């Protein structure tokens, strides 16, 4: 009785469901470990096939959780990880990718991202990313927290037009990218991965969200994700953690936001009317 999840195409032609799973802060409580693992399994079985992680998340701890979650079902998952910019030199990126593969317990990531803009020339990192693609260790590369000038700089370097995604902060409370960055990415066929789709929980106290949630017998969290579902070229990345959470996130896709719902959300969560600096968490 659930409706299918819309899918978002990457430049290379692969498709993933528009609702994925994040792992920030997994791996830190040994009491939570079995729950975290199982929420990610649950998520995959519910069709939330993208799993997002990073080397920084507990220094490989989140990667190891993901690695356990996908045992015997590597093919059910689209696995994303990241390189910290302090590691994003030519040799360092390769070394980072290799530790990531070991932690994840797999031969190849689906998508590997530069975590934010750092001090190594973009062209070195892209070269390392392309050497890794050619080696069968990653399927695709992208970036994260890149503003519109960082994207321009990126295009300018060799192979820089191969960027597969930009992961940036986007939710009802943080809509600044609508003004410039989100349209550029869409016009370019580059998906945006919306991290912190519930603003880390800060959103969930908003009265308008709560009101609309009552109108649909839903949670505020679910109404916040149903919003992002109506945004084309966007893949939302809610953190799972608990199997109940995962099912909640999944069912958010069943919500039909009315025409009146969307105008109401815009009134209470106003789209940007001018360029704003990219917000980062």
UniProtKB/TrEMBL annotation:
Gene3D superfamilies: NADP-dependent oxidoreductase domain (3.20.20.100). It is an enzyme of class 1 (oxidoreductase). Residues 19-268 form the NADP-dependent oxidoreductase domain. Pfam families: Aldo_ket_red. The keyword Isomerase does not apply. The record marks 82 as: Lowers pKa of active site Tyr. Substrate binds at residue 115. Its EC number is 1.1.1.-. The active site is at 57 (proton donor). This is Oxidoreductase. It comes from Rhizobium meliloti (strain 1021).
């Amino acid at each position: 009785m659930h409706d299918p999840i819309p899918t978002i195409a990457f430049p290379d032609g692969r498709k993933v469901p528009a609702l994925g799973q994040g792992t920030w802060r997994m791996g830190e409580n040994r009491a939570k470990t079995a729950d975290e693992v199982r929420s990610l399994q649950t998520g995959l079985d519910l069709g939330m096939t993208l799993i997002d992680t990073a080397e920084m998340y507990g220094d490989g701890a989140a990667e190891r959780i993901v690695g356990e979650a996908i045992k015997g079902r590597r093919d059910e998952a689209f696995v994303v990880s990241k390189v910290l910019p302090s590691n994003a030199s030519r040799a360092g990126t390769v070394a980072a990718c290799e530790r990531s593969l070991r932690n994840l317990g797999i031969d190849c990531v689906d998508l590997y991202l530069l975590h934010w803009r750092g001090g190594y020339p973009l062209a070195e990192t892209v070269a390392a990313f392309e050497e890794l693609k050619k080696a069968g260790k990653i399927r695709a590369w992208g970036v994260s927290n890149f503003d519109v000038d960082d994207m321009e700089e990126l295009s300018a370097v060799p192979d820089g037009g191969n960027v597969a995604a930009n992961q940036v902060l986007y939710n009802l409370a943080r809509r600044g990218i609508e003004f410039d960055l989100l349209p550029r990415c869409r016009a370019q066929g580059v998906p945006v991965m919306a991290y912190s789709p519930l603003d880390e929980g800060r959103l969930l106290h908003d009265a308008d969200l709560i009101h609309i949630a009552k109108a649909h017998q839903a949670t505020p969290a679910q109404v916040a994700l149903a919003f992002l579902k109506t945004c084309s070229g966007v893949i939302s990345i809610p953190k799972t953690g608990s199997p109940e959470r995962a099912r909640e996130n999944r069912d958010a896709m069943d919500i039909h936001l009315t025409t009146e719902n969307l105008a109401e959300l815009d009134r209470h969560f106003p789209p940007p009317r001018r360029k704003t600096r990219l917000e980062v968490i």
